[PDB]
Write an enzyme that holds these catalytic residues in place. Structure first.
Site, PDB file in Angstrom:
ATOM      1  CE1 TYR A 186      -9.997  -8.809 -19.805  1.00  0.00           C
ATOM      2  CE2 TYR A 186     -11.106  -9.482 -17.793  1.00  0.00           C
ATOM      3  CZ  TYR A 186     -11.061  -8.708 -18.939  1.00  0.00           C
ATOM      4  OH  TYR A 186     -12.084  -7.829 -19.211  1.00  0.00           O
ATOM      5  CB  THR A 191     -16.249  -6.087 -40.078  1.00  0.00           C
ATOM      6  OG1 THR A 191     -14.929  -6.485 -39.668  1.00  0.00           O
ATOM      7  CG2 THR A 191     -16.196  -5.293 -41.381  1.00  0.00           C
ATOM      8  CE1 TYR A 245     -14.447   0.206 -29.743  1.00  0.00           C
ATOM      9  CE2 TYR A 245     -14.917  -2.001 -28.927  1.00  0.00           C
ATOM     10  CZ  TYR A 245     -14.904  -1.086 -29.957  1.00  0.00           C
ATOM     11  OH  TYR A 245     -15.373  -1.479 -31.192  1.00  0.00           O
ATOM     12  CG  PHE A 279     -15.849   2.182 -22.664  1.00  0.00           C
ATOM     13  CD1 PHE A 279     -16.773   3.001 -22.041  1.00  0.00           C
ATOM     14  CD2 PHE A 279     -16.232   0.886 -23.010  1.00  0.00           C
ATOM     15  CE1 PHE A 279     -18.049   2.556 -21.767  1.00  0.00           C
ATOM     16  CE2 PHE A 279     -17.521   0.430 -22.737  1.00  0.00           C
ATOM     17  CZ  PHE A 279     -18.431   1.273 -22.122  1.00  0.00           C
ATOM     18  CE  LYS A 338     -18.262 -12.652 -30.482  1.00  0.00           C
ATOM     19  NZ  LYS A 338     -17.175 -12.372 -29.511  1.00  0.00           N
TER      20      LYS A 338
HETATM   21  N1  LIG Z   1     -13.350  -2.493 -22.869  1.00  0.00           N
HETATM   22  C1  LIG Z   1     -14.560  -3.126 -22.881  1.00  0.00           C
HETATM   23  O1  LIG Z   1     -15.496  -2.815 -22.156  1.00  0.00           O
HETATM   24  C2  LIG Z   1     -14.860  -4.253 -23.822  1.00  0.00           C
HETATM   25  C3  LIG Z   1     -15.910  -5.126 -23.597  1.00  0.00           C
HETATM   26  C4  LIG Z   1     -16.145  -6.147 -24.517  1.00  0.00           C
HETATM   27  C5  LIG Z   1     -15.332  -6.348 -25.706  1.00  0.00           C
HETATM   28  N2  LIG Z   1     -14.251  -5.363 -25.833  1.00  0.00           N
HETATM   29  C6  LIG Z   1     -13.293  -5.374 -26.938  1.00  0.00           C
HETATM   30  O2  LIG Z   1     -13.933  -5.053 -28.168  1.00  0.00           O
HETATM   31  C7  LIG Z   1     -13.237  -5.708 -29.229  1.00  0.00           C
HETATM   32  C8  LIG Z   1     -14.242  -6.450 -30.096  1.00  0.00           C
HETATM   33  O3  LIG Z   1     -14.937  -7.491 -29.410  1.00  0.00           O
HETATM   34  P1  LIG Z   1     -15.958  -8.292 -30.358  1.00  0.00           P
HETATM   35  O4  LIG Z   1     -16.783  -9.256 -29.546  1.00  0.00           O
HETATM   36  O5  LIG Z   1     -16.736  -7.224 -31.115  1.00  0.00           O
HETATM   37  O6  LIG Z   1     -15.038  -9.124 -31.365  1.00  0.00           O
HETATM   38  P2  LIG Z   1     -15.361  -9.499 -32.882  1.00  0.00           P
HETATM   39  O7  LIG Z   1     -16.761  -9.178 -33.297  1.00  0.00           O
HETATM   40  O8  LIG Z   1     -15.051 -10.970 -32.993  1.00  0.00           O
HETATM   41  O9  LIG Z   1     -14.397  -8.699 -33.882  1.00  0.00           O
HETATM   42  C9  LIG Z   1     -13.038  -8.409 -33.598  1.00  0.00           C
HETATM   43  C10 LIG Z   1     -12.628  -7.205 -34.448  1.00  0.00           C
HETATM   44  O10 LIG Z   1     -11.216  -6.987 -34.422  1.00  0.00           O
HETATM   45  C11 LIG Z   1     -10.745  -6.811 -35.764  1.00  0.00           C
HETATM   46  N3  LIG Z   1      -9.340  -7.261 -35.847  1.00  0.00           N
HETATM   47  C12 LIG Z   1      -8.856  -8.470 -35.496  1.00  0.00           C
HETATM   48  N4  LIG Z   1      -7.515  -8.515 -35.694  1.00  0.00           N
HETATM   49  C13 LIG Z   1      -7.133  -7.316 -36.168  1.00  0.00           C
HETATM   50  C14 LIG Z   1      -5.862  -6.688 -36.584  1.00  0.00           C
HETATM   51  N5  LIG Z   1      -4.698  -7.380 -36.530  1.00  0.00           N
HETATM   52  N6  LIG Z   1      -5.912  -5.407 -37.017  1.00  0.00           N
HETATM   53  C15 LIG Z   1      -7.060  -4.708 -37.080  1.00  0.00           C
HETATM   54  N7  LIG Z   1      -8.249  -5.218 -36.718  1.00  0.00           N
HETATM   55  C16 LIG Z   1      -8.342  -6.490 -36.261  1.00  0.00           C
HETATM   56  C17 LIG Z   1     -11.693  -7.605 -36.645  1.00  0.00           C
HETATM   57  O11 LIG Z   1     -11.769  -7.097 -37.973  1.00  0.00           O
HETATM   58  P3  LIG Z   1     -11.836  -7.997 -39.325  1.00  0.00           P
HETATM   59  O12 LIG Z   1     -13.254  -8.420 -39.652  1.00  0.00           O
HETATM   60  O13 LIG Z   1     -11.309  -7.055 -40.390  1.00  0.00           O
HETATM   61  O14 LIG Z   1     -10.986  -9.230 -39.156  1.00  0.00           O
HETATM   62  C18 LIG Z   1     -12.987  -7.347 -35.926  1.00  0.00           C
HETATM   63  O15 LIG Z   1     -13.506  -6.113 -36.421  1.00  0.00           O
HETATM   64  C19 LIG Z   1     -12.202  -6.627 -28.597  1.00  0.00           C
HETATM   65  O16 LIG Z   1     -10.907  -6.028 -28.721  1.00  0.00           O
HETATM   66  C20 LIG Z   1     -12.627  -6.729 -27.149  1.00  0.00           C
HETATM   67  O17 LIG Z   1     -11.526  -6.947 -26.258  1.00  0.00           O
HETATM   68  C21 LIG Z   1     -14.068  -4.414 -24.932  1.00  0.00           C
END
Ligand SMILES: NC(=O)c1ccc[n+]([C@@H]2O[C@H](COP(=O)([O-])OP(=O)(O)OC[C@H]3O[C@@H](n4cnc5c(N)ncnc54)[C@H](OP(=O)(O)O)[C@@H]3O)[C@@H](O)[C@H]2O)c1
Ligand code: NA
Ligand code: NA
Ligand code: NA
EC number: 1.3.1.104
Lengths: 365, 365
Positions: free
Chosen positions: A58, A178, A275, A300, A360
């Site tokens: 990271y 989701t 994102y 983003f 989570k």
């Molecule tokens: N750029 C930014 O500012 C920023 C900031 C914070 C977080 N994020 C990103 O946002 C994303 C979500 O964070 P979160 O806290 O919301 O996590 P989260 O609630 O735990 O959920 C992760 C998501 O990824 C999906 N997923 C996991 N493996 C997958 C695959 N092989 N193919 C397709 N979908 C898959 C899951 O879907 P299922 O329920 O179907 O398993 C779930 O919808 C992460 O990638 C994180 O890095 C970005």
């Protein structure tokens, strides 16, 4: 007058199961500099970015220090968390004992019991007693406070800072429906009167998940198989036509074929924001969308966006806080594991990493 | 009094080999409205966009009409060409007999012998006698005038209209380095004092092609194999380091792995413009460039950009004309086929479609 604290550290990058351990350290509450404050942790989650920091992959990471009393230089873990003020120094006026706070900057290290900092290392949140005494119908829960600094602001800023959607008429589309961010975006869409399509993976309990996302605020929910279907394109065009609006914004956290599918459903002059990339596959866009439909694809990153823009961070966070107090926003529930001292602290976080597929994970204190 | 003309038409979309035919029609040169002009074609090329229009897979196309005297509505073919003015009406002052012109708008239909139009359907270019009387060292050739309205403007506008490169310091990178647009971009980059990297396919006479592209104006030339090799990747960073500038712009006409490779070589905050593609290769960008390097990918289509912007089209065209006259720009040579009336006109163009892999095909008159 010495406080004994615990912190999860590592001396070398690697997989959390291999490199994490717990270190005891002391904080002297009888000798605070004028602007210093002492906080106790109430809860902190396991986010993917925290794991990538430990792995060494990271681009933003805390420095290794000897400040926790280690034999070797060691780094802390965690960027998000909820803390309660225990004691402040003689020149501190912005905080008092009992106030709820979050870190104001990244790399704070939130996987630990206590911390010492300056008053401007923290942002104040109202605690439940304060919200209730001022006539608000709700107060923040610990999970809501511990996760407020990232995912709710990500969804809000992606939906409001880049394209202006016309209320009642225009649409956004997102995959990972989701996910935590996806569920915040459905609710904010509903609160601002935006239409939305959520794309989700199929599952054994599909009907129950669909009903739950529509109650949060998704207008329609479709499977990845439906997202891939070219024969489905006319149904989606008719949804958009009936509302008198256009699909202007796509939110991508998956990549690969899923990103192709949601890009194809935008009207002309559409914008995609990437994102995340949970599929680990690259963003894949047909040439014809760029050339003939004036498509744009961008990124983003909330940390970069808010780096030198604290009016925007303050104003966004205040709105999320107000919506929680008024009962208009809800969090996705975390699996909570309480630290009571019978099991070492780093093992609770190692379990949280291993079980993150279940949902989570929040460690509470 | 009456001019008999020929036009290549079709009544239904499809492959040129199957749907094209030639239609005879009449123009009355004694009955011109005050603002009408009659022109005679000098040459018009076969471009990929012209073929995709006929096939029905290009979203900008002329309407089918009965204006050529057909039994069914029919559409003409071709979007660029060079014409000579034969006669003008009583109120025309911007053009006179003998002037060279191009169409002012797309979808005019240039695969034909003659045309009747209004004076504002045409843009004047200097003919060789006029360039010579103005003291210029060169005049335009027929190939230069007939192909001036697409590929030279594409290269110029991509390099100047979107991101500002600092002369002497900053870089652009492009694939399809031996294409017509790629060769124009190298020359224009040199005139604007921009540094550039051209990525090209490997080939037997590589050293001769590299020397030739550097003489046109490319600063460095690499193969697709080297673009994909991370072992080769440190050399490119040092080129940019030594110049004191940054790689800010990528031009993509290939897609797939090639688009990934040139995207990875931009500095933070880079922009990619996609203006062409290869059959089945979508644009493929790693998630991490969007999130952590603030990368943006967008499209380019000269037809749409210049649709309602005649000032931009005019000032760009004037500069390309001046550069040909001053000897600063060179065109790729076309294979020219002369129409003398022994073979139907649509068959010359059908041969041009079939032989386009031998090089640019120009039908002359
Ligand atoms: N750029 C930014 O500012 C920023 C900031 C914070 C977080 N994020 C990103 O946002 C994303 C979500 O964070 P979160 O806290 O919301 O996590 P989260 O609630 O735990 O959920 C992760 C998501 O990824 C999906 N997923 C996991 N493996 C997958 C695959 N092989 N193919 C397709 N979908 C898959 C899951 O879907 P299922 O329920 O179907 O398993 C779930 O919808 C992460 O990638 C994180 O890095 C970005
Ligand atoms: Na395409
Ligand atoms: Na070419
Ligand atoms: Na990536």
């Amino acid at each position: 007058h010495m406080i004994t604290a615990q912190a999860v550290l590592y001396t070398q990058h690697g997989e959390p199961k291999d490199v994490l351990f717990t270190q005891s350290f002391e904080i002297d509450d009888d000798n605070l500099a004028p602007n210093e404050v002492i906080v106790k942790t109430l809860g902190s989650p396991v986010n993917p970015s925290d794991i990538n920091q430990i792995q060494g992959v990271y681009p933003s990471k805390p420095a290794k220090t000897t400040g926790f009393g280690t034999t070797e230089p060691a780094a802390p873990c965690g960027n998000e968390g909820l803390f309660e003020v225990i004691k402040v120094g003689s020149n501190v006026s912005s905080l008092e004992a009992g106030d709820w706070v979050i870190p104001s900057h990244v790399n704070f290290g939130t996987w630990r019991t206590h911390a010492l900092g300056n008053d401007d290392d923290f942002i104040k949140l109202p605690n439940p007693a304060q919200s209730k005494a001022n006539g608000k119908p709700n107060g923040l829960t610990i999970n809501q406070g511990a996760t407020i600094s990232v995912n709710p602001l990500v969804a809000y800023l992606m939906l409001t800072h880049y394209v202006k959607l016309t209320p009642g008429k225009d649409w956004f589309i997102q995959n990972g429906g989701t996910s935590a961010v996806g569920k915040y975006a459905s609710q904010i869409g509903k609160l601002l009167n935006f239409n939305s399509i959520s794309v989700i993976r199929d599952r054994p309990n599909l009907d129950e998940v669909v009903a739950s996302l529509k109650e949060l605020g998704a207008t329609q929910v479709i499977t990845e198989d439906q997202n891939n279907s070219r024969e489905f394109g006319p149904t989606i065009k008719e949804w958009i036509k009936q509302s008198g609006g256009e699909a202007k914004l796509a939110l991508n956290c998956v990549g690969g074929k899923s990103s192709t599918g949601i890009a194809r459903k935008l009207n002309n002059n559409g914008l995609m924001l990437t994102y995340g990339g949970m599929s680990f596959q690259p963003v894949t866009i047909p040439t014809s969308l760029y050339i003939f439909k004036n498509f744009t694809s961008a990124g983003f990153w909330v940390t970069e966006l808010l780096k030198n823009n604290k009016e925007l961070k303050t104003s966004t966070l205040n709105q999320i806080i107000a919506w929680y107090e008024e009962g208009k926003l809800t969090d996705a529930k975390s699996i909570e594991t309480l630290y009571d001292g019978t099991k070492p602290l780093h093992e609770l976080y190692q379990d949280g990493v291993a079980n993150s597929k279940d949902g989570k994970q929040l460690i509470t204190y």
